[PDB]
Structures are given as structure tokens and as C-alpha cells.
Design a protein around this nucleic acid. Structure first.
Lengths: 213, 82, 99, 71, 22, 129, 132, 218, 82
RNA sequence: UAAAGUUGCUGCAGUUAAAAAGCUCGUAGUUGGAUCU
RNA sequence: AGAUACCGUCGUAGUUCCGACCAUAAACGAUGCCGACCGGCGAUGCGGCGGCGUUAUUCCCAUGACCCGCCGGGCAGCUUCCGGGAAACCAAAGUCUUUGGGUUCCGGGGGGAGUAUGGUUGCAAAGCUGAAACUUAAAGGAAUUGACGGAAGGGCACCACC
């Protein structure tokens, strides 16, 4: 936030985070994720410090904004939980999405069909998205990740401490990232809530898709 | 860098990791140079300025690039104190 | 070259382990290096369950079981196919097969 | 490891002197058995009397008669 | 030849020499 | 048991600097360690350090600035004359452009250039570059 | 064995990737359009590619096909993903929050929020699965 | 004609990257040998260090491939080493030349003593290692020449080192490991942090950031 | 991780360490003033006492030695000093 | 003699290539924590 | 085929104990001891410290059995581009040409050969110490691809079977 009242945390943001359960980590704690937790609960669940989450989200948004060609940022999601969120983020901010399987050699094999050379990489989970993470170490590609308590931080340059297992949490995290990137760029404004709401970024089961119509 | 006559004789001056102050080699393809955008004090928008941080491949490999970039941003006013 | 980190036995932190005789050949093998199976068997085979149950003098006798611990040397355990050779990477897996 | 003390010169020198005897060439040169066993007795050349002409078979991979002389 | 059997052979040779060399 | 506390301190500084750490803890502290550290710091190789005073034998927290390639000890402390200094420099230092050999001389603990300036010899403590 | 080889499958994949709108609904239309815009040497091969075109298009009505990168499929996916209710799932009146996360909020200058509700902590610390 | 496949290649072809040192400064991978052909293609000299036949036994006889070790480099601070294995010797040599061009690294040169004139030797003692072969390079006085074995001498001369002392340990008979170890020792010259490289580094816009819109319109 | 630093508090990371391994070593024990309800005077007892101490005016077992911290009898009110 | 860092003080090795005593104790030898302007 | 062996039936010394001897093992972690430093994680054994809650002492506290942690030694394990190594692999077999913390034993191509001889110890068997002449261009280590296996697991053809 930079100790800026314009960039500080709002009550609506905290309420959304609590409703989505973003503060809820796992029973395991990666030693490089210690500074981002608050305390362990009596049932073993680690609580993620939401102020630190906001700080890291704003730092990631600043890193994304400082790339003039938006298509030079790649947003990855191998898991089905974050594919919809990544597609919506790419549509909103102009980034390039890789939803689904990330074929190896996409960053390293210049002969390949889907070969692309991003300037920044954002992944939904270091564990699930370990392949783009490892490939980023071959082409000088910095990485932004949504990291749970037990996520490994290797090849992750900006880790956003959050629950990345729940569909609500992942969707909301991507939604906040898109909102903050747009706000920092110049599009939209902080004087009014954003028109999009996080439920559009969420992943929904096909049974729920059928039921809700 | 220099000789007795005073001119600079190196081919180039390689960068140093902003966290470890070690030379980043010519073939350190895991090293990154990340620019973090500066934000205008009153409106919170990108003002065209940024602060650069070069992190070597070793630091990224040991998982310490995240904490090092956090430390640099905190010492640079980007990340709020406390 | 060393094939296994534990040398194919569980002897860590002691010098000597008492031997036992293989049930198949009467070979002396250390108790930690011996390959141990604990069989629980119905004393009446599946085909003979009906006949004995019908011929019982009681109602719902629930037939007794048989608890036999077998200790095998490596050669007899390999020939009997209790254990088998594995790939260099699958060797390290100590997880028992599903049952 | 090896000793590194300012007063270990006797230890180092003595250990080197004992360990030099496990050098095959050093032992051959300094034991005196090889010089005794050498028919030339330390000479580069020697004069002799030819006793007979002997034909020596070349070793197995090759095949020839090496024409030698007993002297 | 197995090393221990060669060792046994050498032991037997030494014993025979000790017997013969009175 | 531990001899040569300076060897332990130098190995600790070396191991910490190779891991890219910002500070290193050294225990026990000693006058020779403090003088060697001061020589290292006057040439810009370590940075500031704090002497924690416990009533038995102090500790030192040394701030590391990653300009150090190798700090090492030379055991035993061979007596070094001004003639042998060039041979020791050739053996130990990576270049004639940089790197220092630290000696303890009757004029104090100093690098090899300062020992040549005062025209003195002494005993080699170690080296850093 | 009626497995269709990579020639048939890949040619049909390229055709549906390329001339997705040009296709028909009946197999006999499919073979005619395939023979119009493809150098297929023989009748049997063009029949086989046409048949797999029909089967692939049948697979299209229910979802995407892995090897196909048509723009219309992306448009369909992005329209299907453009669903939003009138009420956000995160818009709820009562949020159950444990005391520890309440203390986290309070140290975060958010202890004055009245949207949360006290959920009592667990009776015990029995969360590990039994060992062995 | 050269049709660049990478962003770096496109930036180089359009005269946006003024030197090869701008690529080395940001440590960008060079995936196109035409970049090196552009920047140094008039002064590079390639030498086939060796052709080595390697045999893989099969159901009937040994399948033989030939591995070309090729050293390349202009004699003014750039050198590369490339190894390529192929069925035919000619294509192995072609691929090895390509790979040596791709692996060209800068060479830092220094002074043994007084700093009059251009640098002539290695800035300091540097050791390189490859598969039990250790090659140590030591600064030497001006006019000494390369005091080394022929294999490291070739690479050191190609790198613009005029005088240097050499030590070698291990199975240097294996020419590939010897060459790779001396190449590693040469490439470690610019990775060594000497006190003249203590000045704080002034960060510059990377080529991808500086000429972004050029690539966007493409 | 940035030892002896006030910016990141570590009372909790220092009293967690081994007593000898702390920055400055300090005992984990204490002396305690004990009142016995039947008695009328202070008794200063070591926390890790190895002696079965009795009241200075009576014959009541104040505490018993254990493997570590001594076990006090019921009703005796004990308060640490300093 | 150098090459031989294949006698290694500089400067070698000792899991599997040659090699750490079966294991402890122990005199000589060697080596020894902080601290005094 | 032969068996002098494997397999079977017997069976002496021995295997057991007491008192003297012997001092050797793939006596192995094929890895000397002491000290410092350099990742992560979950367990486990002992001791201590702290703490919701559950049980037994059929009553207060305490004390046991659990549960959640912390600290110290210990046997280990998993993981890791710490680093090393010829590699196998090793958080030591790391902190090594950027080579020096202290110290003991010990190796120097393969055989001859742990042999001869001398000394010494032992009742003996043998143990410790321990060559040379001579012979030889390799012997050896790790890993790779094949071939083969009286190794295991699969698949296929009515030139296989049912």
C-alpha cells in the first residue's frame, strides 16, 4: 500500500476476504511462508494475515502494471479451480491466458507452435503450476504466485499469501488482482465499487451450473 | 574497470543482485530484473516511474527471491512499514 | 556398489541381532533381515465351510482361525514369490501393497 | 588429516621418510637388491662372450622368431 | 580359486613345511 | 575441543557470506578476532559489527556486505619475514590488484601492505579477498 | 478393429479447425465439402475423414475438442463463463469467524465490524490422522 | 534471409540492440546464432577441436555417431565452445559451430601488475571444473604468453588472453572435459567480484522494456 | 534472521531457545518466596530445588525434588522474585 | 632432474578404484578457550 | 556319466557350564576421534518445560494413559540446484587450486604375496611384524547400450493351445 490512505485496505475488501475464507490456510506451514501467517488455530488451521495479503497483492499489481504491453504478462492455471478466474483476468487486463494443461517447452522451445515469451508470469498455485514455474527459470521470467501456507516459494518472486484451494478464494483473489491492476493503470476508479463482482470469476461445478439456471 | 591512464577497459559492467551484491553472470538465465511501478501519492495511479530490482538465479532457486524483493520494496517505501 | 541404504535389513543402532530359522529351508537369517509374513487363515477352507457349518452341533459356531507367522530367507521368499525384484526407483518404496 | 604444528617437523620428515619406501622406484633404487640382481651391475653396457645362438618366440598376439644370443 | 580356499592351501603348505623341516 | 577461535570465526563468516546472509554470529569473541575484523572492515569487506558482552566471552554480530569471496586462517601462525611476504602473497592472494594477507606484528595486527610500509614482519594470521 | 488412424483424425482436425462453418450436418454433405477443398486421392480416405468429421462435430455439440483451436469455440467458452447472479455469493449478512481470526482483524483495525458472528472454538485438538 | 523467431532476434535485426554487451548485461538466452553472426560474424574464427566417434551397441553391431567439439571466438574478448553429436561428421561440425556461436561468453581481462595499456591477462586466479578436470588460470606478466596445454591454449588465445599461467588436474586426456573446464574458467572471469566492481549498479531498461512498442506492432 | 534487532520483536523467539544458546544466556529457573498457611514467615526456595526443604519454624515438607522443577505442597502460596 | 599434485610442507589420497587399527584406555609426542592500556 | 557334494538315515569331536589359553571375522556404516559452521519436514526414544480438552485413581491437588507444542542429547527417515563426487551417491562423503581448526592410523599399477626369512607370542592351531628375485600393460571403480539368464512379470499368431 505504501502507507497511502488511497491504497489502504477497505472494509468491503476485508468482508469479501472473510466470506470467501481467504484467511484460512492449511494444517501445514512452509517455512518461507511464516512471515505471512498470524497464528495457528486450535484445529491446526493457520490464519493468513490479511494485511500482508493486501500488501503482497498491491505489490503484484504494481509489478503487473509496470509492463506497458499487457499481452506480455502470462496468467496460468493448470487446476480447474482457477481457469475461469484466469480467463476473466486476461479479458479484463489484456493479459495472455494459459488455462488448462501447460505443455512443457512453451517458454523454452522456440520451434514449438505455442511458443511465447512473456515478460511476467502469474500462477494460481506453485504446486500445481510447477511446470511454468520451472520454465520461468530458463528465460529470466519473474513470477507472481497465489501461495497457500504450505506452498513452496522456489522460483516465486512475489508470493500472495492466500487460500488457493477453495474456488471462492481463488476467484476472489484473481478478481482483486484484476481490480487493482485496472485501478493502478488508470482504467476505472477507486471512488466507486467496480461493476464486475467476484462471483463471475468463480469456478462452479457443472451440477451447480445446471441447478442455478 | 580502469587502468593507469584513467579510461575504463572492461567490455561491460555486469549487474549485481539487489539482495546479495553478487555479480549476475552472462548466462544466468534464472536471474530476473523486475520493475515495480511507482504510484502517485494522492490518486493512487501509475505515474510512469518504477523501481528496479535484479535478483540472481541462486536466490530464486533457494526460494528467497520473494523475501528479498519484499525487503527491498519495504526499504524502498513501496510496501508499507508494518 | 551399495544396492540399499539399509543393506536389506533393519539393523540400525545395534551390533548383533539374534537369528531365526527360515520356515521353508531352516536357514539362519537375522530377525531384522528375515522377511516376515503373518497369515490369518480360516481353519476350514472356503469349500468346506458349508459342510462343517451344516454338520455343526451348535448354532452359529463361528469357526476358529489359524495365526501363523512365517519367517523367510531372501532366497526362499524370492522363490515363493512373497517378494520380488523391483526397479531401482521402485525399490525405495516401503509402502505395503493394498489389502 | 595430517598434522599442522610448528613443532611437527620431526613427525612430518619421519613419516615422509618411512612412506617413501612404499614407492616402488625409490625402493628399487635405494634397497640395493636390484643392483645386486642386475647382471650389468649398474653399468650401461657390458662385454660378453657368445655361448650359443638362441631363437626366442614372439609373444602370443604376434608370431616370429626373435634371433637372440646367450652371452 | 576362492580366496579363502587359497588361504587354506597356503596354511596346509606351511604346516607341511613345518613338519618336513625338523 | 576448539583451538584457534579465529579459525572458527573466519569459517563462520565465510559460510554465512556464501549463503548470502546479511549478518553472522561469531562466538567466542577475542581481541585477535576483533582486530582481524577491523582490518577486514577498513577495506570495505564486511561492514559494521556489534560486540555482545556476556560476562564469560563475548559474541560478535557481523553485518555482511556481499563483497567477500574468501576469508581464511593460516594455521600454524608461520613467522613471516619481509622477504617471504611476496611468496606468501603469490600463494594466497588471487591477484596482485586486490586481496590482503593479515599479519600480527609487534606494531599491531595489519595487512601485508601496511606491514611493508612500516618495514616489519610477523606471524601470518590469515587472508581475505 | 475400427480405430481411426492419425491421418484420418488429424486431417479431420485440420478441416474442422479451418472450415468449421463450411461443414454440414449430414455425413453425405460432409464428404462433398471435404472433397471440394482437400486433395484426398481416393474415395475411401475422403469417406473416412468425412466420417470422423461427423463424429467430431457430434462431440462439438457438448464441448470442446482438444486438438481444435477454432475461434468460435473460444467465443462459446467465454459466453458460457459470462454468468453472474443478482446477489454475490460473498454478499452475506452473517459471517462465522473464529476468535483467533477476530483477534487478527482487531489488530488489523477491523474489530469494529458488526457483520461477523462468534463461532465457538473446537472442543479439542484432534486433527491429525492416526499414524501407521 | 534471416527471419527472427525470438523477441531478441527481432530487436537485434532492426538495429535496436547496439551491442552484444546489452544482451550479456541482462543475461538473456541467445536462441538464434544469427544474432552472434550479426554482432561478431566478421571476426569470429571457429576451430574444430576434435571429432570423436561414439558407439552404441544394438541387436546387430554398433551404431556410430561423431561428436564435434568446436571452439569459436574473436580474439578480442569473446569465446564459445560447442559440442554436437550426429550421424555424419559434416552435420556434426555444422551443429557444433552453431552451438559454439550460441554459447559465446564475454571475457574479462585484467593486468598482472602495473596497469599501462590494454588488459592482457585474466583479472585474477580462476578455476573451472568439468568431470574431474580442473583448470586454473593465473595472471601472468605481459609478454609471457599462454603457458598451458594445447587444448586450453586454443581457447585462451581465442578469448584474447595474451599471457596466462595454467594449472590442470585430472584426466585431461579426455579432450572434451579439458575444453569444457577451461571454458568454465574463462567464463568465470566476469562472475568474479573484484573491488573495482563494488560500485553500486545503475539499472537500465531492458531491451524488452525499452523497445516494447516495436515488438507490439510486429 | 537479522539478529539482536528491535524492529522485529523477539521476546518469544528468545525465551523459546535453549538457555545456553540464547544471545546472552540466562537461567530458566527462579527463586520464590513461599508462605505456608500454618507458618508465619517467608521461605525463599529455588524452583529446581534438590533438597526436601522444611519450614523454618515447623517440620512441614515445603517441596520435593523432581527431575526438573521441584514440586510444592498444596496450600503453600509461592511467588517468584524479580 | 622436471614432467610427479604418481611421496603431496606448499600439495595427494583412504564408502565402492590401493587404503580407517575389532574396540576402548593410556605415557611420551603434537595441539590447546576468554581475559591484564 | 562320475558325486568324492547338494538330498535322506545315523553319527564322533563339538554345540552347554566352570577354570585356563587363542586374539581372529564382510569384527562393516567396507566411512578414525575431537571442535565450529552450513537447508527444510514429519516421526520416534529418554529427560525437562508449557498448555484447551478426554479418561483412571471411583473423593481436592498430584500422579499415570491420551492430545497439542517447545528445549536438549539419541537411533533413524523423507526431501532439497547447500555444496561435493568418476559416478553410484552423501546434509556429510559439504564448508577443497578461493587448497592450512587439532590429532592418530594408514595407501602409492596388477601379480609374486601377507609368500619367504628373521624376530616375537602360543601347548597347538596359529597371531603380530614382514621382503626380494621375477613377471606383467593393464588389473580395477562407477555408470551406459546391447546380448544372455535353468530371474520375475506381461502381450501376440489355429505355422500356439483350448
Amino acid at each position: 500500500s505504501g502507507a497511502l490512505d488511497v491504497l489502504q485496505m477497505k472494509e468491503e475488501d476485508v468482508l469479501k476476504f472473510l466470506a470467501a475464507g481467504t484467511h484460512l490456510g492449511g494444517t501445514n506451514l512452509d517455512f518461507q511462508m511464516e512471515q505471512y501467517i498470524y497464528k495457528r488455530k486450535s484445529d491446526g488451521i493457520y490464519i493468513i494475515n490479511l494485511k500482508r495479503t493486501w500488501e503482497k497483492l498491491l505489490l503484484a499489481a504494481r509489478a503487473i502494471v509496470a509492463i506497458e504491453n499487457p499481452a506480455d504478462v502470462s496468467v496460468i492455471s493448470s487446476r480447474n479451480t482457477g481457469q475461469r478466474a484466469v480467463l476473466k483476468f486476461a479479458a479484463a487486463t489484456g493479459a495472455t491466458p494459459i488455462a488448462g494443461r501447460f505443455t512443457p517447452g512453451t517458454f523454452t522451445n522456440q520451434i514449438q507452435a505455442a511458443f511465447r515469451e512473456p515478460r511476467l508470469l502469474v500462477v494460481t498455485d506453485p504446486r500445481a503450476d510447477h511446470q511454468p514455474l520451472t520454465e520461468a527459470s530458463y528465460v529470466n521470467l519473474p513470477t507472481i504466485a497465489l501461495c497457500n501456507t504450505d506452498s513452496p516459494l522456489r522460483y516465486v518472486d512475489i508470493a500472495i499469501p492466500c487460500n488457493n484451494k477453495g474456488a471462492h478464494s481463488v476467484g476472489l483473489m484473481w478478481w482483486m488482482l484484476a481490480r487493482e491492476v485496472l485501478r493502478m493503470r488508470g482504467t476505472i476508479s477507486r471512488e466507486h465499487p467496480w461493476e464486475v463482482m467476484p462471483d463471475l470469476y468463480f469456478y462452479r461445478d457443472p451440477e451447480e451450473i445446471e441447478k442455478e439456471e | 574497470m580502469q587502468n593507469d591512464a584513467g579510461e575504463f577497459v572492461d567490455l561491460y559492467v555486469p549487474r549485481k543482485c539487489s539482495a546479495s551484491n553478487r555479480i549476475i553472470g552472462a548466462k544466468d538465465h534464472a536471474s530476473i530484473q523486475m520493475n515495480v511501478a511507482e504510484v502517485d501519492k494522492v490518486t493512487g495511479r501509475f505515474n510512469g516511474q518504477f523501481k528496479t530490482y535484479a535478483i540472481c538465479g541462486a536466490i530464486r532457486r533457494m526460494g528467497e527471491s520473494d523475501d528479498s524483493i519484499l525487503r527491498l520494496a519495504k526499504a524502498d517505501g513501496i510496501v508499507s512499514k508494518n | 556398489t551399495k544396492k540399499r541404504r539399509n543393506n536389506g535389513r533393519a539393523k540400525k543402532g545395534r551390533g548383533h541381532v539374534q537369528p531365526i530359522r527360515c520356515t521353508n529351508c531352516a536357514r539362519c537369517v537375522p530377525k531384522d533381515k528375515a522377511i516376515k509374513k503373518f497369515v490369518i487363515r480360516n481353519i476350514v477352507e472356503a469349500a468346506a465351510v458349508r459342510d462343517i457349518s451344516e454338520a455343526s452341533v451348535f448354532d452359529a459356531y463361528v469357526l476358529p482361525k489359524l495365526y501363523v507367522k512365517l519367517h523367510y530367507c531372501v532366497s526362499c521368499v524370492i522363490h515363493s514369490k512373497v517378494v520380488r525384484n523391483r526397479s531401482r526407483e521402485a525399490r525405495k518404496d516401503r509402502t505395503p501393497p493394498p489389502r | 588429516g595430517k598434522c599442522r604444528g610448528l613443532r611437527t617437523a620431526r613427525k612430518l620428515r619421519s613419516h615422509r621418510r618411512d612412506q617413501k619406501w612404499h614407492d616402488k622406484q625409490y625402493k628399487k633404487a635405494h634397497l640395493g637388491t636390484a643392483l645386486k640382481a642386475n647382471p650389468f651391475g649398474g653399468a650401461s653396457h657390458a662385454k660378453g662372450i657368445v655361448l650359443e645362438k638362441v631363437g626366442v618366440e614372439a609373444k602370443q598376439p604376434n608370431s616370429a622368431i626373435r634371433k637372440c644370443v646367450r652371452v | 580359486m576362492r580366496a579363502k580356499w587359497r588361504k587354506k592351501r597356503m596354511r596346509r603348505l606351511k604346516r607341511k613345511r613345518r613338519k618336513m623341516r625338523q | 575441543v576448539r583451538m584457534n577461535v579465529l579459525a572458527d570465526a573466519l569459517k563462520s563468516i565465510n559460510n554465512a557470506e556464501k549463503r548470502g546472509k546479511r549478518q553472522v554470529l561469531i562466538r567466542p569473541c577475542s581481541k585477535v578476532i576483533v582486530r582481524f575484523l577491523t582490518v577486514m572492515m577498513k577495506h570495505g569487506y564486511i561492514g559494521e559489527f556489534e560486540i555482545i558482552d556476556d560476562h564469560r566471552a563475548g559474541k560478535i554480530v557481523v553485518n555482511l556486505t556481499g563483497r567477500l569471496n574468501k576469508c581464511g586462517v593460516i594455521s600454524p601462525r608461520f613467522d613471516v619475514q619481509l622477504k617471504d611476504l611476496e611468496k606468501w602473497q603469490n600463494n594466497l592472494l588471487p591477484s596482485r590488484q586486490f586481496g590482503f594477507i593479515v599479519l600480527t606484528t609487534s606494531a599491531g595486527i595489519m595487512d601485508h601492505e601496511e606491514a611493508r610500509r612500516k618495514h616489519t614482519g610477523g606471524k601470518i594470521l590469515g587472508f581475505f579477498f | 478393429g475400427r480405430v481411426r488412424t492419425k491421418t484420418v483424425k488429424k486431417a479431420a482436425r485440420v478441416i474442422i479447425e479451418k472450415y468449421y462453418t463450411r461443414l454440414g450436418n449430414d455425413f453425405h454433405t460432409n464428404k462433398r465439402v471435404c472433397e471440394e477443398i482437400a486433395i484426398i486421392p481416393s474415395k475411401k480416405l475422403r469417406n473416412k475423414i468425412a466420417g470422423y468429421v461427423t463424429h467430431l462435430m457430434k462431440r462439438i455439440q457438448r464441448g470442446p475438442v482438444r486438438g481444435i483451436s477454432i475461434k468460435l469455440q473460444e467465443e462459446e467458452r467465454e459466453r458460457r463463463d459470462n454468468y453472474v447472479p443478482e446477489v454475490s455469493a460473498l454478499d452475506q449478512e452473517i459471517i462465522e469467524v473464529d476468535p483467533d481470526t477476530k483477534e487478527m482483524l482487531k489488530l488489523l483495525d477491523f474489530g469494529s465490524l458488526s457483520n461477523l458472528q462468534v463461532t465457538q472454538p473446537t472442543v479439542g485438538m484432534n486433527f491429525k490422522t492416526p499414524r501407521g | 534471409e534471416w527471419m527472427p523467431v525470438t523477441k531478441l532476434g527481432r530487436l537485434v535485426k532492426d538495429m535496436k540492440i547496439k551491442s552484444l554487451e546489452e544482451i550479456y548485461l541482462f543475461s538473456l538466452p541467445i536462441k538464434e546464432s544469427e544474432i552472434i553472426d550479426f554482432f561478431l560474424g566478421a571476426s569470429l574464427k571457429d576451430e574444430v577441436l576434435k571429432i570423436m566417434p561414439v558407439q552404441k551397441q544394438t541387436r546387430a553391431g554398433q551404431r556410430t555417431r561423431f561428436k564435434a567439439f568446436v571452439a569459436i571466438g574473436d580474439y578480442n574478448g569473446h569465446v564459445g565452445l560447442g559440442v554436437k553429436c550426429s550421424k555424419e561428421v559434416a552435420t556434426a561440425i555444422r551443429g557444433a559451430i552453431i552451438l559454439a556461436k550460441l554459447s559465446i561468453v564475454p571475457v574479462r581481462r585484467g593486468y598482472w601488475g602495473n596497469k599501462i595499456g590494454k588488459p592482457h591477462t585474466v583479472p585474477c586466479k580462476v578455476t573451472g571444473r568439468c568431470g574431474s578436470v580442473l583448470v586454473r588460470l593465473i595472471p601472468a606478466p605481459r609478454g609471457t604468453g599462454i603457458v598451458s596445454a594445447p587444448v586450453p591454449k586454443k581457447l585462451l588465445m581465442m578469448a584474447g588472453i595474451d599471457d596466462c599461467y595454467t594449472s590442470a588436474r585430472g584426466c585431461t586426456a579426455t579432450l572434451g572435459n579439458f575444453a569444457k573446464a577451461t571454458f568454465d574458467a574463462i567464463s568465470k572471469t566476469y562472475s568474479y567480484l573484484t573491488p573495482d566492481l563494488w560500485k553500486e549498479t545503475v539499472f537500465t531498461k531492458s531491451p524488452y522494456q525499452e523497445f516494447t512498442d516495436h515488438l507490439v506492432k510486429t | 534472521p537479522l539478529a539482536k534487532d528491535l524492529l522485529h520483536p523477539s521476546p518469544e523467539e528468545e525465551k523459546r531457545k535453549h538457555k545456553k544458546k540464547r544471545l546472552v544466556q540466562s537461567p530458566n529457573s527462579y527463586f520464590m518466596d513461599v508462605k505456608c498457611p500454618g507458618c508465619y514467615k517467608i521461605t525463599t526456595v529455588f524452583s529446581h530445588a534438590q533438597t526436601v526443604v522444611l519450614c523454618v519454624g515447623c517440620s512441614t515438607v515445603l517441596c520435593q525434588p523432581t527431575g526438573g522443577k521441584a514440586r510444592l505442597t498444596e496450600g503453600c502460596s509461592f511467588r517468584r522474585k524479580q
